[model samples]
Target: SDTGRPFVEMYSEIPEIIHMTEGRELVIPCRVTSPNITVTLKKFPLDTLIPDGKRIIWDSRKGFIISNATYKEIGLLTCEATVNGHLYKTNYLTHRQTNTI
Candidate 1:
């Protein structure tokens, strides 16, 4: 088998701005070139965000999950993937809208 060039690419069809409502769950898809890739989620002005098993979590296939979405989670979310020693990234803006009841 050939251990060829390092491969690390991200999905580009995702919308730049994602709008969500309060008390709802949001999934930020982050499919990469390979399934064996390592992915992490990070927010702007801060470092990488770890899964707390309550609000936020990372899934290899389902991407980043935000439970009970709200204004507090609104901001720029960057997804980074490492594959074969190469790094790749993409950003998505999280916009929380009022869910007037």
Candidate 2:
């Protein structure tokens, strides 16, 4: 267990630019070195948490999934990672809406 690492790294894998439509749900595949930290979603342009992420944060292998996607959810997403009450790292992603999947 001597990885010699104090903290961990987290981020998404399945296309950061999430494109969704009304009444649709999509999963954002994510990858993290370890789940020894808290993961939060930050939407760009306003530097705030998108309404979709405020509900909860899941550490699923499928990554962060957004349910019932909406137009307002479209923007740059930045995933913040913190450890032991200290900020460690942050990841970024772009979300948008498209006519077709």
Candidate 3:
């Protein structure tokens, strides 16, 4: 049945501007509701992360994960997925934050 088709969508767990502390892990939520899907995470200016499985990785349930977050990781991120021969996309903005106290 067509009703069984999974809806490809990126949930809004990420805000317009993500404030991250240095040396911390950053999770960019790009969860898609489908098993048969191809997802890709990209940073602005043509930086497509190929999930090195070390520093950067993508999980369908946990989303994108970045280790040891830093200012160098601050930028606009876009998530795109192809499911059931359909394409869906979303965007996220991130920045670095200093800690005090």
Candidate 4:
């Protein structure tokens, strides 16, 4: 009965260190397939479920976004996902440029 669930990987297409500029978009990309999968994002030090749209916004297609990125927002962000109960994840060490326009 478990055909598609045999064993496939769901992972992040984003890099380990996502270096971006300030006052810009910070997207931690991770693919979900969302067909037989689900994605969850978490931010450290604050332990808040991010991109919840209450304050942070989850942006497009494998989307995890902070519309206006800041240095204070820097942290170890993880993209977690489950596919057929097998864990696949990636970490984003967020860094931004000190000199911004």
- On lDDT, the candidate that comes out on top is 3
Model 2: residue 53 alpha-carbon error in angstroms: 8.3
Output the worst ten-in-a-row residue range by lDDT, candidate 1: 1-10
In model 2, what is the error at residue 56, expressed in angstroms?
A: 5.3
lDDT of 3 by residue, 1-101 (tens): 11343324444555357776668898877765643465788788778877777887666666778886766568888876655466566777877766523
lDDT of 4 by residue, 1-101 (tens): 02253213333565467677877777666544443444567666535555567445654355566777776457777766555566566667777756655
Local error of candidate 1 at residue 17 (angstroms): 0.9
Tell me the TM-score of model 1: 0.68
Candidate 1 per-residue lDDT, tens place, 1-101, comes to 01342223244656368776767898767644444555677788766777665787655556677786756667888787554555566777777765645
Clashes within 3 Å, all models in order:
0, 1, 0, 0
| Residue 67 C-alpha lDDT in model 3 | 81
TM for candidate 3 is 0.72
Give candidate 3's error at residue 51 in angstroms.
Answer: 0.8
- Candidate order (TM-score): 3, 1, 4, 2
List the RMSD of every prediction in angstroms. Answer: 4.2, 5.0, 3.8, 4.7
Pairs of residues at least 3 apart in sequence or in different chains that clash in candidate 2: 17-94
Model 3 regions lying over 4 Å from their true place? 1-15, 34-36, 99-101
